[PDB]
Design a protein around this ligand. Structure first.
Ligand code: HEM
Length: 146
């Protein structure tokens, strides 16, 4: 019931996927600059110009919309997830650790801007842990590391 809880807390996010999408990626890039290089479209953008950047916010919106779809599946996510693992391993070539980095940023932003309290934070970290474990498994099956 870490999923039942999370969906309760998701409302404020789904109310504005574009602003929160922009916040989450800004924070990722400011706190973990090495991750900006993994986005050819965004690499080399001045740190001063990230916040409020429309192309970043638009991609952030896509990120969150897809995470929303994953959360709403409440653990029966294989059919949504596998395609995400497919693209991220073979087209974008993203090492698993980066998924841990954005999960921790999402928790921090939701805590600060969307009312995610200590309890919600725990439930979300548990859900994210499940998803990343599943992503790891799919990466394995694709032969894209360990
Ligand atoms: C839970 C986390 C994430 C979700 C839900 C997600 C979702 C998506 C979606 C829906 C797309 C577009 C469709 C596709 O190509 O699969 C995509 C593209 C992409 N993702 Fe992710 N992503 C996640 C994490 C990351 C991370 C951590 C990075 C690198 C640090 C990353 C790098 C990329 C890149 C480079 C693209 C292509 C952008 C483009 O060409 O416009 N993703 N992501």
């Amino acid at each position: 019931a870490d999923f039942d809880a999370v969906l309760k807390c998701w409302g404020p996010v789904e109310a504005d996927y574009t602003t929160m999408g922009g916040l989450v990626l800004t924070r990722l890039f400011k706190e973990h600059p090495e991750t900006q290089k993994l986005f050819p479209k965004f690499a080399g953008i001045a740190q001063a110009d990230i916040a409020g950047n429309a192309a970043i916010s638009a991609h952030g919106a896509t990120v969150l919309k897809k995470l929303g779809e994953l959360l709403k599946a409440k653990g029966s996510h294989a059919a949504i997830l596998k395609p995400l693992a497919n693209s991220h391993a073979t087209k974008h070539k993203i090492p698993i650790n980066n998924f841990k980095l954005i999960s921790e940023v999402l928790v921090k932003v939701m805590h600060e801007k969307a009312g995610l309290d200590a309890g919600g934070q725990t439930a979300l970290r548990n859900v994210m842990g499940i998803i990343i474990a599943d992503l790891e498994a799919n990466y394995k099956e694709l032969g894209f590391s360990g």
